[PDB]
Amino acid sequence: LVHVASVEKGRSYEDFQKVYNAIALKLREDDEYDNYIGYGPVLVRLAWHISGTWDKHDNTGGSYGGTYRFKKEFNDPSNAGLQNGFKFLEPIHKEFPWISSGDLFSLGGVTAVQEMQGPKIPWRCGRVDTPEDTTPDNGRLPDADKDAGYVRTFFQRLNMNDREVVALMGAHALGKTHLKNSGYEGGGANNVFTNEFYLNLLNEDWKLEKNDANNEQWDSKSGYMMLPTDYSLIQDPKYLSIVKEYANDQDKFFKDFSKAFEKLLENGITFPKDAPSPFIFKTLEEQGL
Numbered sequence: 001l002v003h004v005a006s007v008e009k010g011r012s013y014e015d016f017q018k019v020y021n022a023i024a025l026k027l028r029e030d031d032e033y034d035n036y037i038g039y040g041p042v043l044v045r046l047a048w049h050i051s052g053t054w055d056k057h058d059n060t061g062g063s064y065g066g067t068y069r070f071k072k073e074f075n076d077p078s079n080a081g082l083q084n085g086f087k088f089l090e091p092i093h094k095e096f097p098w099i100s101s102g103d104l105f106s107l108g109g110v111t112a113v114q115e116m117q118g119p120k121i122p123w124r125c126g127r128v129d130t131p132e133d134t135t136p137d138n139g140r141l142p143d144a145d146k147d148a149g150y151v152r153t154f155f156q157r158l159n160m161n162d163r164e165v166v167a168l169m170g171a172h173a174l175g176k177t178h179l180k181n182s183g184y185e186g187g188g189a190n191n192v193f194t195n196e197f198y199l200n201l202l203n204e205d206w207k208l209e210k211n212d213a214n215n216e217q218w219d220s221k222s223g224y225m226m227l228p229t230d231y232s233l234i235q236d237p238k239y240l241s242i243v244k245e246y247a248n249d250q251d252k253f254f255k256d257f258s259k260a261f262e263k264l265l266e267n268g269i270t271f272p273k274d275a276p277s278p279f280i281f282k283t284l285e286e287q288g289l
């Protein structure tokens with residue numbers, strides 16, 4: 001099973017920058033969403049979920065196929081709430097129908113991260129829409145009620161190591177949990193990409209409680225929350241070290257996240273030797289737009 005990247009015919013950097021810009025402009029002007037969080041966080045989550053289906057053992061799933069457009073994956077309980085990201089991207093796709101679904105979904109996550117003042121995420125095109133019988137079964141994305149051993153084992157399926165895992169989890173500084181979506185409630189409702197996930201883990205006084213859906217979560221007096229899988233990053237000594245490193249080094253966190261997030265979005269894709277170099281898109285701000 002090889003998924004070879006194939007550049008959308010006749011497209012170049014500028015074409016993709018235009019799609020980036022459309023997403024970013026819509027992020028700016030659809031700012032009311034989810035009590036003024038905006039769509040940034042959910043678009044980051046969508047990019048991660050469409051990528052997180054990958055299995056290194058047989059090379060199935062991941063972003064290449066754009067199979068989130070299909071009913072089985074669209075309706076995965078693990079993807080509850082992602083329909084909002086899909087709806088956001090739908091007019092974007094109609095404006096730029098030449099882009100593959102997987103390129104669009106992954107590009108939305110890149111754009112969201114950069115537009116929320118995150119690190120630049122290099123991004124490669126060439127994901128190709130594959131048929132419905134390539135859609136991965138439900139159950140490939142991770143549960144939140146688990147411990148560090150689970151997180152570590154889970155992520156080995158996506159060929160991620162401890163540093164990559166800890167880096168990627170910093171995305172949980174963004175957005176919030178929604179009881180109706182996941183059985184968890186709360187979060188900072190933040191839309192600026194920072195290293196505050198790690199600072200919060202280390203600095204808050206956390207109490208493990210049951211929530212209204214009778215799930216376990218960690219709550220702070222200041223009103224932040226952490227999933228059991230989030231908190232496992234300070235229970236495990238290897239993860240804790242890296243948590244401390246990112247809490248104390250914003251630039252290192254940015255750089256490591258950029259690498260891990262790109263890798264996440266590219267898992268399962270074979271890039272031929274004559275493929276274009278990754279693109280680094282300019283923000284609206286850098287374009288004076």
Ligand code: HEM
Pocket residue numbers: 041042044045048080081142143144145151168169171172174175176177178179181182183184227229261
């Ligand atoms: C152990 C792995 C992970 C687990 C168990 C997990 C679990 C969760 C849960 C339960 C939610 C709340 C969803 C809702 O209630 O709407 C959430 C939200 C979120 N997750 Fe994760 N996550 C994991 C890893 C990741 C990764 C690797 C990223 C991206 C790099 C990511 C990005 C996000 C973002 C941005 C949100 C907020 C979305 C919003 O505000 O709508 N997560 N996650």
Ligand SMILES: CCOC(=O)c1cnc2ccccc2c1N
Pocket residue numbers: 172173174175176177186187188189190196197200224225226227230
């Ligand atoms: C502000 C950083 O710490 C948090 O408040 C926090 C912790 N875990 C989360 C897990 C999922 C979504 C949001 C999350 C979140 N916002």
